[PDB]
């Protein structure tokens, strides 16, 4: 879902942290 | 809608944001 969530619309670093290890 | 070109950017962003925690990148 990162590709769906952040390619059509802009993701903040706050949203992106959800994908870290 | 070029997900492959988009993905290239995503991986660089995750590198900066995750730092030492790292990440798993799955092109699902
Ligand atoms: Zn590019």
Structural domain count of chain B? 1
Q: What is the DSSP letter of B12?
A: H
Cβ contact (<8 Å) for B1 and A7? yes
Strand partners, B23: A20
Rounded to the nearest angstrom, the minimum Cα separation between B8 and chain A is 10
Nearest C-alpha neighbor of B25 from the set B14, A13, B16: B14
Domain that holds residue B28: 1-28
Compute the distance from residue B10 Cα to the ligand 1 centre, in Å: 10
Residues 6+ apart with CB under 8 A from B1: A7, A8
Q: Say yes or no: B11 contacts chain A, CB-CB below 8 A.
A: no
The span from the first CA to the last CA of chain A, in angstroms, equals 16
């Amino acid at each position: 879902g990162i590709v769906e969530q952040c390619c059509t619309s802009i993701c903040s670093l706050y949203q992106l942290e959800n994908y870290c290890n | 809608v070029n997900q492959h070109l988009c993905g290239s950017h995503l991986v660089e962003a995750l590198y900066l944001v995750c730092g030492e925690r790292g990440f798993f990148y799955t092109p699902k």
